Every structure is written in C-alpha cells, then in structure tokens.
Amino acid sequence: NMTLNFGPHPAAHGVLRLVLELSGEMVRKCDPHIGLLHRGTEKLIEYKTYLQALPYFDRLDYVSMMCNEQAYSIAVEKLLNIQPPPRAQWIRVLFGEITRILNHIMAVTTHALDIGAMTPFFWMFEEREKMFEFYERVSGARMHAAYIRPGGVHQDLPLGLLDDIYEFSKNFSLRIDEVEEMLTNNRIWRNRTVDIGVVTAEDALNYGFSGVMLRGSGIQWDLRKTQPYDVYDQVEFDVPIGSRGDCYDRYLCRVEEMRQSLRIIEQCLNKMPPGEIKVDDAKVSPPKRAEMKTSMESLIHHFKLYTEGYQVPPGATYTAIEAPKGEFGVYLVSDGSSRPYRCKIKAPGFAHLAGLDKMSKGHMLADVVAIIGTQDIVFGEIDR
Amino acid sequence: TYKYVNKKEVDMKSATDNAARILMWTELIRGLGMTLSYLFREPATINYPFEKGPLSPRFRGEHALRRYPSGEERCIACKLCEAICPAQAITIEAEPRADGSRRTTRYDIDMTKCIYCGFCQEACPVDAIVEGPNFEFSTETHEELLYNKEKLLNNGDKWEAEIAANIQADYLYR
Amino acid sequence: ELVEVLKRGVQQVTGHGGLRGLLRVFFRANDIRIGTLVGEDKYGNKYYEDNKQFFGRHRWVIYTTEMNGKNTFWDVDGSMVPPEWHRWLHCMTDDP
Amino acid sequence: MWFEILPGLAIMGVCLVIPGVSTAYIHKFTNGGKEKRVARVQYQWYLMERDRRISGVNRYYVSKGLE
C-alpha cells in the first residue's frame, strides 16, 4: 500500500489531498485530507452583521449559490419570528429549484468529465449559462447574487423574467433527455458506475449522509416534503427514491430531480402571487429608496439598518433545507447583538466525504474518481 | 409522493434482442447518433471582442463615483458605504471643504478586497457610489487595482451616460 | 436549398467591399457575415445588428484602426468600444 | 456551421492522396513508362535480370520480336 498522495491538479474540486495506500491498482485505505480551502467563514461571520454575512453563504457552496442563502435567510427569519411575504416565498422556491438544476448539471456533467465523457459537460454548460443569465437579470451577478436576503428577496423580478424562465424550462427537458441518450444506458457508463460505492440503508443514516446518498439507498427522506420550508409545501413533486443504491442509481436520482424541479418551476411560474418581495417591517427589511428619500422614519431605519443591523433577539436555531447536495443547515446562536455569535454551517459534504472510506473499499484508482463524483463534493462547504 | 428510478421472461425474441444489443453494440451506435446530430446544429459561441454576452441593467461590474449634473460630486461622506462593505474594502476619511460642505478627502475602494456584493450601491443615500457596467478592467499590476477617489470619479465621468441609463431602468424596482 | 446556401455565402464574401476588404474582416475577426450598420461612433468603430442571428451574435462591432492612434487594427481590445455604445453591444438596452 | 471542419480536412485529404499518386508515378517514370516489376519469387527476379542482361543496362528497355 504505497501512499500515492494522490491529489492536488487532480479530479476533485481543486483540493483533495487524498492520501492513499494502494497495493498496485487496489485501494486499501483512503484518508481524505481537508482544509485546503478552509478560509475562516465561520469565524469571520462573528465579526460581521447579519446582512453583511449573507454574501458568505453564497460562497460556502457556490455551485448552489442561492439555495444556501435560503438556509441563512430562514434561520435569521426564525430568530426574528418574521416570515417573508407570499411573492418572495415563491421566488425563493423558483430560484431555489433553478439552483438545484444548476447543481445537478454540475454534478452529472463534472462526474462524466472525470469518467472521461466530455460532451455532456459542454451540452449542459450552455443551458447553465442560460440560467446564470436569470440570476444576473434578477440579482446583478451571474453567481454569488446575494438576492435572497434574511427577510425575503432583495428586489422584485425584472419585468419579463418569468416569461424567459418559461421558454428555457419548456425546452430544458430535451437537453436532459439528450444527456440521457448518451449516458443513462451507455454500455460503458453503467459499468464504471454500477455496483461501485454501494452504501447500505442503515449505514447511510449512521454516517449522517442525509442527501441523494440516503435517497439513493432507498431511505425516503426529503426535508422538503418531511419538513416543508417556504412554499415547497404548496407545490407537488415526487422524490426520486432509488434501490440497489450505487453510483449509477444515485445518478439516475439526480437526473430525476432535475426532471422534478422542472415540474416545481412550472408551477411557481403558473402560480406566483402579486405582492411585495420583502417584509414590511422596516425594523428587519431596509426601506424602499423613494421612502428613505422622502420620509424621516425611513431614513432613520435605512441608516440604522445598513450601519448597525437587525438586532436579532437572543436565541439559537438549527434550520435545515434541502440544498441540492443534501441537508444544508445553519446553527446560528445569537446574542441580542446585531452581529451573530456562532454560525456552524452543516455542510452536506463533510459527512459524505467521511464516507469515502467506507464506500471505496477494495476499489481501483478509477473507482475513487467515480465516488468523489457521486458525492458532489464542493470543497467550499466541507472546508468552510 | 415518491418514485422508483431503477426498481426492477426469457424469450428467444427477448434474449435474441438482448444478445444483439451486446454483440453488435446497438446502444453504443445510438450514442454516436446524438453527437453526429449536434455536429449539424449551429454553435452557440460568440466572437468575444466583436460580440458581447448580454448583461442587463443590475449587473454590478466595476465601481464608479457619480457627480450631480451641475458638477458637484454626489458623495457627502456619510461613510455608511464603508460601514456596510462586507470586505472592509472602502476606506473613507473626510473634512469640511472650504465651501463648508462635507466631502471625502480620500475614498479608496480596494477592488482586490471588494467581492462586488453591490451593497454599497444599495446603502448610499445620495447614491454616489454605483456598480458600473464595465467588467473589463483587468490590470498588469496589483497597485492599479487599488482605486482612489480620482480613478473612481474618472471612472464615473467615463461611464456616467450608461450608469444614468442603467439606474433609470432599475430605480422603480428598488 | 444548398444552392441558396451557396448564394448566401457568395453575397457575404461580396458584402465586405472588395476582395481586399473581406480579407481585412476575415483576418481580424475570422467571421464573415453581412448586417445593417446601426451606427459609427466618433472613435473609429462600426456597429451592425442582424435580427436573424441568435441572441449571442445578433449585435457585433467591427473595431477600427487607431481609435486613439494605437495601431489597433491587429491588437483588438474589448475596452475600445465607447461607454455610450457598450450597453447596446451587451444588450443592456435595445435602443441604439 | 459544420461547414468549417472541411477546410482542415481538405488539407488532410490532399496530403493523403499525394503519397499514393506520387509513389505510383515516380515508379512509372523511374521504370521507363512501365509499372516497377515486382520480384516476389526467384523466377520473377531471374526474368527481371535476364532481361537486364538481354539489352542496354536496364530492365524496362524491352527488346521485341525485332531482335
């Protein structure tokens, strides 16, 4: 088992000092190393106000840019016992899902690039591109938007976005269908993926996998159906549960949630209400710029909110959503101050990597590459 | 509501069908057809210098400091753009200009520190600091990226016409 | 069908002035297509928009030599386009 | 469109026919207007050299009934 220090530029998100002892081409033990991307996200937040810590969440796992923001939002809203306005909720579910697609296009196509199939990535990165443009025309940034803030969305959708999030959705399916005709039944995709990294159901719950990784093993758990957040309760979608959990089965699950998210996006476009996109409590949400420039109470509320902060009531909460990777949760302890006290980010990914050892046993070097792909490891969330 | 993604007789017809699939690589040929199909589709790439990828009015891009039409710079050094910057990028120190008005002696946005959040655009009461459309400001030296008041004011003067159009389009939304 | 495809290719080649004119467009851009000229800015630049082409390529600018006396004919730069016409090129505003 | 992959191919094709036409005309010009005889078995060489010994100092030169 000659340690190969296999890793950094490898087939991971830049940083995997995956030191491994391999008897020839068989892996005896995998000890993943982490922290090549630790940056301090958890300590930095303690020194920043709630609204100026929102941009950190987008960077925690940036393939899933917004879905992460929703988790902090929800958490800060709970502590304040404020809830967003109805239109904002639908928006967050609209962009929440668009983001899930974006993550799955990343996970399925990047999985293939490491496997060696390169054309699916270019096919779907063009669709991704088109989605980014939604982000940009809603937030201003292609990724790292900062659109979902603790009290709702920042600004209403541009006048015309919904129509385009339709044209795209109306077609994206065929694009998923194509990838399929190239990989779902490839006589070769199956081999490198089938029966690789099988994880039992009991073991998946035990190692805290909590994601497709659980769903792929047949455990039925979607925090979006079990514990509804926002208005994911008002929509109707089917969790894609899997059997014979293995790299191929979970994949099929990720392609199926891409499909189910188009079902949720359709609805959101069909039923998004007229209304405001941010709470009306100037206490939590910043006042509209026409108001702060004509009304004294609004300037005072604008000045205090931007300079000092929300001033969340003292308490602590663990709120978890179903980020595309898995359960993303923020444990946000908070003193009465405007800046948080602690904000442990639970990363679906710290648990998944740990499982690499119990998944890739008696496996070849190529198998390890396939399994890192089937966990959608974004080192930002793991390293935080 | 759940769904089984992969949850599952032997007849000559069936077997012969299956054996042909393994022997003559039928599904592999299916995959080749898909790629041949696109080869015939129009490529989606754009001539980058000649044609530019579309950015709508809210694109944050590069920082600029605006001026009133009259010509008086908008910033009045309230310094909350400094307060809400997440990265500590903006450094502002001020003193009363001889006019008696309030102006910033030094306004330095460290763009390498800045993470282009666009909150400064949000926070300014006079809306003096704006996220300008330009994204192409790559520089040979690190020092050029650090920007003082004169570069930003100059950036503001160069892009004021488009900045005004962009703010014009999006202010009702804000 | 393809003969009309061939006539379209011939018109594109004849479209850029003389043989030398298209050679000039050919070398600096590597793409030959004909479009209505929306405007020419005071810094030497020429802008064309074609409705038929897809969203990414329907608006293009053919840069001109020495727009500030820089010998820009070969070292084309994105920043050369003026701020007024930058948003038209990036589709920020439909109006020219 | 896909039209453009053709330029490159053209220069490949043209560079894969040259060799076959070239080798097959530098033979018919360095062997007196006749394919270069292929001496695979001793007998084909014999007649090939016998012919050399027959006339001139080259095989392509072929003396006929008028000799």
């Binding site: 063009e126 088109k130 044209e167 109306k170 077609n171 399916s173 065929l174 694009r175 269908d177 194509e178 005709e181 | 299916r30 057809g33 898909m34 041949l36 199909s37 696109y38 015939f40 589709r41 129009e42 989606a44 | 069908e1 393809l2 495809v5 409705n51 897809f54 969203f55 | 469109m1 896909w2």
Partner: peptide, 28 residues
C-alpha cells in the same frame, strides 16, 4: 437554425426526436 430541411432531417434521424421544437439558438 438555417437547417435547410436536409441537415435538419439528418439531425432529427440521428437524435431520434425533434430539436427544431427545442433549439439551441434562442431567438426573439
């Protein structure tokens, strides 16, 4: 687009579905 009605049919036959309905070129 600009399939010409023959490249489109090779495209449809090879793909096995109608890309014309869901094109890669976004239009007005």
């Amino acid at each position: 687009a600009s399939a010409t009605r023959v490249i489109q049919k090779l495209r449809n036959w090879a793909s096995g579905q109608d890309l014309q309905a869901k094109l890669q070129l976004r239009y007005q």
